[PDB]
Each structure stands twice: as C-alpha cells, then as structure tokens.
C-alpha cells in the first residue's frame, strides 16, 4: 500500500548522502521525506554490532563494550564493538574480525540477527547483531591484543552482565559519556526479564 516512487540526490559526500524520497502514503497522496544513506553499502547490511559475552569461570559474565570519541556526537560514547562489513565478508566474519581489532578478544559465534535498522525515520542504515561468546579462560584471551586501524582509538570496558544497567547509568552520571541506544536497550531487558 505505501511505496517509494523516486529518490532525488540532494548531497553526496565521501561517506554519506542526503536524499529526498518521494513516496505514496496510503491515502493515495504523494509525500516527501529527507533520508540519509551511507555511500559504502553493497552486503546484507551496512555493518555489524557484536554482543560479546566474556565468560570466565568463578567470575561474573561480562559484556565487553568500547568507548570512543564520536565526531558526530562531539563526545565520547560507549558502544558494542562494531564496524562496516567488508565487500565479500560474511556478517559472522565481520563480527569476529571487528571484535578482535577493537578489543583483542577472540570469540565464538552464538547467533546472528537478520538485518536490523539503526534509525529508520532518518536513514536506511542496517546492521546484523551478532552474539559472540569469549572464553576468557583460554590463553588467546589472556592478554588480548587489539589490532586497531589507522585513526581508530578505542578503550575497552567490560561490565558485568547481571548489573549492566546500573553500571551504565553510573558511567553516564559520573563520566558524561553517552551510552548507545542498543547497549541501553539490552541492559534494560536484562532487568526487565521476568
């Protein structure tokens, strides 16, 4: 019943473009929307985000997160490890790779989502969310070695799964970091579960 009729390019950068979408609303009226797209997508999705469950015996399970400066935010943010899927990469493979580059941890795939939207009122951006467990007791994850690219500066922050929400709320109150909405949503459901 609703559909896209055309897309007019407004402005194209190296990484991002702005478009004006014309679409048919369900009353049979023609309408417009300003839409953002990345210029990098081919793939299943633009990117992956990794939910990395650090499992170590006799310890609480941790969720491994990363803190970085985000120029669009003008501030530091706390996020799941994430990045863009290389052309010819699978989502699962991008997840292990990104997880290694950003944290040094080497992990195992548990499940992978279908492509899910990031901010669908604004952009077409999508990701796979890939749940990964990290055997924290193996020697490869003893002194994890982050292999970050040129210009990436990432701090690793592992927080306990069973108090995640309170821990994030603290980082926000006390560090003026911004927590990512997917990370916050995850933390909320850990509390809301039964």
Ligand X SMILES: CCCc1nnc(NC(=O)c2ccccn2)s1
Contact 156, 134 (CB under 8 A): no
Which whole-number Å values give the CA distances from 21 to 4, 7, 10, 123, 124, in the listed order? 7, 4, 10, 11, 12
| 149 touches a second copy (CB under 8 A) | no
Segment near Cl ion (CB under 5 A); pick from 47-55, 72-80, 160-168, 172-180: 47-55
Site for a second copy in 40-69 (CB under 8 A): 49, 51, 53, 69
88: tokens are 């010819």
Contact 117, 125 (CB under 8 A): yes
Among 40, 56, 76, 90, binds a second copy (CB under 8 A): 76
53: tokens are 């469950």
Which whole-number Å values give the CA distances from 42 to 38, 88, 89, in the listed order? 10, 9, 11
98: tokens are 């990104």
Four-residue CA torsion sign, 181, 187, 191, 194: positive
Cβ-based nearer residue to a second copy, 93 or 115: 115
What is the C-alpha separation between 22 and 75, in angstroms, rounded?
34
Least separation in angstroms between CB 27 and a second copy: 8
| 87 touches ligand X (CB under 6 A) | no
Element (H, E) at 79: strand 75-79
Segment near Cl ion (CB under 5 A); pick from 35-43, 50-58, 77-85, 169-177: 50-58
The separation between the first and the last C-alpha atoms of the chain, rounded to the nearest angstrom, is 38
Least separation in angstroms between CB 191 and Cl ion: 8
| 121 touches ligand X (CB under 6 A) | yes
Cβ-based nearer residue to a second copy, 1 or 143: 1
Cβ-based nearer residue to ligand X, 34 or 111: 34
Cβ-based nearer residue to ligand X, 119 or 155: 119
Among 86, 99, 129, 145, binds a second copy (CB under 8 A): 129
What is the C-alpha separation between 20 and 48, in angstroms, rounded?
26
| 15 touches ligand X (CB under 6 A) | yes
Residues of each annotated binding site for substrate: 15, 33-34, 38, 70, 84, 119
**What is the contact surface with ligand X in residues (CB under 6 A)?**
15-16, 33-34, 121-122, 150-151
């Amino acid at each position: 019943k609703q559909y896209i009729i055309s897309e007019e390019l407004i402005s194209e950068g190296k990484w991002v473009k702005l478009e004006k979408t014309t679409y048919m609303d369900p009353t049979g009226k023609t309408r417009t929307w300003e839409s953002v797209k990345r210029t990098t997508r081919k793939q299943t999705a633009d990117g992956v985000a990794v939910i990395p469950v650090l499992q170590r015996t006799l310890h609480y399970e941790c969720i491994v997160l990363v803190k970085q400066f985000r120029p669009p935010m003008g501030g530091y943010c706390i996020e799941f490890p994430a990045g863009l899927i290389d052309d010819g990469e699978t989502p699962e493979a991008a997840a292990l790779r990104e997880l290694e580059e950003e944290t040094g941890y080497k992990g195992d795939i548990a499940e992978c989502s279908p492509a899910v939207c990031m901010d669908p009122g604004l952009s077409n951006c999508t990701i796979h969310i890939v749940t990964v467990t990290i055997n924290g007791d193996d020697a490869e994850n003893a002194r994890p070695k982050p292999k970050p690219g040129d210009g990436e500066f990432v701090e690793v922050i592992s927080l306990p799964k069973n108090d995640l929400l309170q821990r994030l709320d603290a980082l926000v109150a006390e560090e003026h970091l911004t927590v990512d909405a997917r990370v916050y949503s995850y933390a909320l459901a850990l509390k809301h579960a039964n």
